[PDB]
Amino acid sequence: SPPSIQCSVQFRPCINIHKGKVKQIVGSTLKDLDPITNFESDKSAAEYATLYKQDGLKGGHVIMLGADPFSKAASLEALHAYPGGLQVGGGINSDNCLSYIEEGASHVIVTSYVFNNGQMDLERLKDLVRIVGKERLVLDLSCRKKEGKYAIVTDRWQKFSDVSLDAKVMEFLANFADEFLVHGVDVEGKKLGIDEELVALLGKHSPIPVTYAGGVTVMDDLERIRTAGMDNVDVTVGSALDIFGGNLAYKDVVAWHNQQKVSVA
Numbered sequence: 076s077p078p079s080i081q082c083s084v085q086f087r088p089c090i091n092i093h094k095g096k097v098k099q100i101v102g103s104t105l106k107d108l109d110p111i112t113n114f115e116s117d118k119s120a121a122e123y124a125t126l127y128k129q130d131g132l133k134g135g136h137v138i139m140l141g142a143d144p145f146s147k148a149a150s151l152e153a154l155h156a157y158p159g160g161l162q163v164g165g166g167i168n169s170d171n172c173l174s175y176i177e178e179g180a181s182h183v184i185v186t187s188y189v190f191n192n193g194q195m196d197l198e199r200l201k202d203l204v205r206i207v208g209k210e211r212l213v214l215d216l217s218c219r220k221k222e223g224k225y226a227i228v229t230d231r232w233q234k235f236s237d238v239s240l241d242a243k244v245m246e247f248l249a250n251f252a253d254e255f256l257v258h259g260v261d262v263e264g265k266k267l268g269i270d271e272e273l274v275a276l277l278g279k280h281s282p283i284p285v286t287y288a289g290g291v292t293v294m295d296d297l298e299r300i301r302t303a304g305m306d307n308v309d310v311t312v313g314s315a316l317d318i319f320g321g322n323l324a325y326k327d328v329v330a331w332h333n334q335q336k337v338s339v340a
């Protein structure tokens with residue numbers, strides 16, 4: 076709870092593009108293998124990107140949710156507005172991963188492509204690193220408590236894998252990923268608070284930077300990210316931000332992000 080001169084928890088914004096529009100939803104209600112929608116807008120994804128660039132927020136992510144091809148064009152708008160500022164995910168694979176780097180993304184975020192038959196596919200994973208480099212790959216290990224563990228979920232969170240999120244998995248995938256992104260899908264988009272157990276896990280055993288996402292609702296929940304995460308876990312807020320129809324002031328969340336860069340001088 077008291078500040079840290081060494082560590083600084085980053086706010087990592089998001090842009091959730093579904094069927095061509097910017098939305099925030101309860102992602103666990105997507106059934107495309109109607110989702111509960113928290114917010115829709117016709118504002119171009121490029122305007123959210125420009126806002127983040129203005130406030131110096133780096134390492135946020137654009138998600139192309141679903142197969143609709145108009146989501147691809149809206150994502151390139153945001154990446155073109157904020158070159159190098161955004162990670163981009165949503166159906167990244169071997170054949171298109173490099174293309175997203177060449178459109179201004181700093182990273183691609185991957186889950187489903189590196190999973191086959193419920194297992195981590197080592198050869199697919201090595202193909203990403205070969206093409207884009209580990210430094211431009213983010214692995215998303217979003218998960219859901221199942222039989223006492225955190226099972227990783229694939230295919231837009233509509234399939235349980237057979238890999239559980241634990242220390243041994245993170246030590247291994249860290250040889251292939253610059254960073255980890257982890258949604259607590261049970262609580263995601265539902266504006267009810269966060270998963271403290273998952274954040275505590277991510278902060279104890281992740282050897283590379285890890286962003287938690289899901290259910291951040293009030294400013295006090297940002298202080299739990301610090302507390303449970305031992306100042307090791309970055310945090311995403313989506314459905315609660317006032318710019319996505321919530322009650323949480325985006326400007327307050329930015330101020331909190333800058334308050335974490337504590338300088339003695």
Ligand SMILES: NC(=O)c1ncn([C@@H]2O[C@H](COP(=O)(O)O)[C@@H](O)[C@H]2O)c1/N=C/N[C@@H]1O[C@H](COP(=O)(O)O)[C@@H](O)[C@H]1O
Pocket residue numbers: 089090091099100101102103104105138139140164165166167184185186187188215217229230231232256258262263264265266288289290291311312313314315
């Ligand atoms: N059903 C889904 O919604 C879904 N499924 C997968 N993704 C992401 O897409 C990316 C690519 O996955 P693959 O296509 O490679 O499997 C990965 O990062 C996935 O986690 C999904 N979308 C996540 N959306 C994010 O949920 C967060 C909101 O938080 P909140 O404060 O609580 O409102 C923000 O990060 C939103 O952009």
Ligand SMILES: [Cl-]
Pocket residue numbers: 190191192193194229
């Ligand atoms: Cl699979």
Ligand code: NA
Pocket residue numbers: 091099100101102263264313314
């Ligand atoms: Na959401």
